[PDB]
Amino acid sequence: MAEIPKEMLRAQTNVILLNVLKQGDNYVYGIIKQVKEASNGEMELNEATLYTIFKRLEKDGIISSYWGDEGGRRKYYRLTEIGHENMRLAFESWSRVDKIIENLEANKKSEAIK
Amino acid sequence: PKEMLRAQTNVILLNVLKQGDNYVYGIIKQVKEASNGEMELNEATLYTIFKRLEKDGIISSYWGDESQGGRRKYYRLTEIGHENMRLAFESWSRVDKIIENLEANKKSEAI
Numbered sequence A: 001m002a003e004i005p006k007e008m009l010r011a012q013t014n015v016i017l018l019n020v021l022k023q024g025d026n027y028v029y030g031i032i033k034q035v036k037e038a039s040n041g042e043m044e045l046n047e048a049t050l051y052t053i054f055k056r057l058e059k060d061g062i063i064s065s066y067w068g069d070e071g072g073r074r075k076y077y078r079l080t081e082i083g084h085e086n087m088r089l090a091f092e093s094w095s096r097v098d099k100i101i102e103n104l105e106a107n108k109k110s111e112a113i114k
Numbered sequence B: 001p002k003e004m005l006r007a008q009t010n011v012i013l014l015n016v017l018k019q020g021d022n023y024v025y026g027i028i029k030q031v032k033e034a035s036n037g038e039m040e041l042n043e044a045t046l047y048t049i050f051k052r053l054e055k056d057g058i059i060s061s062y063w064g065d066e067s068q069g070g071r072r073k074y075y076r077l078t079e080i081g082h083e084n085m086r087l088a089f090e091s092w093s094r095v096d097k098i099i100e101n102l103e104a105n106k107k108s109e110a111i
């Protein structure tokens, strides 16, 4: 079928959460709240989905966590320096993909004239 | 990175087939040519992706060149494949807006 597959869906959630963190260190609750506001109430993530994703991100060295303060202590997550680098390299990589796509279209268009 | 290179090869391949039916060697050549020799797609990875896109009905395939004594597999982008590309663009656009909204709402809370 044509539906967005679970690998692309996971890639999409990833990008959103990594962009939340890129704006500022945040705790799970705050993160979910921010995404809900930014999706106009339509994307309200399950905290378990964040924990699943953060597990792997933390394991990969892309985010880390630390405790806030108190009435009660919060766990903050943060984009690491390698996280930030990764995001830049991914922007650049995919920007090159887009140029290759651009060129495939241009060559098709130009070879049709000729 | 593993999964993102595969995702990239996926997108590129879909785009070559959108440009017209093609076979595995031609796709790899065409992509290398569109990248000035810099992108060389892994044959192995093409086959793994093709196997999956065929199962999803996103691409189909047929034999060509039997009149020349050959037997070469060509791939084509199906209507399901066109839609998949539409939805990918639409869902990633949706992602972009949300991220744009995150930046603006952040900016609302600075001023």
Ligand SMILES: COc1cccc2c1C(=O)c1c(O)c3c(c(O)c1C2=O)C[C@@](O)(C(C)=O)C[C@@H]3O[C@H]1C[C@H](N)[C@H](O)[C@H](C)O1
Binding pocket: A008, A011, A015, A086, A087, A088, A090, A091, A092, A094, A095, B004, B007, B011, B088, B089, B092, B096
């Ligand atoms: C159909 O395209 C895709 C299909 C499957 C997976 C993917 C994509 C895809 O397009 C894609 C991206 O475009 C980008 C990323 C990505 O993972 C994917 C896919 O996984 C990574 C990214 O979040 C970072 C860190 O820069 C942004 C980047 O988009 C770039 C270019 C866009 N035009 C936009 O400006 C965005 C903000 O940055």
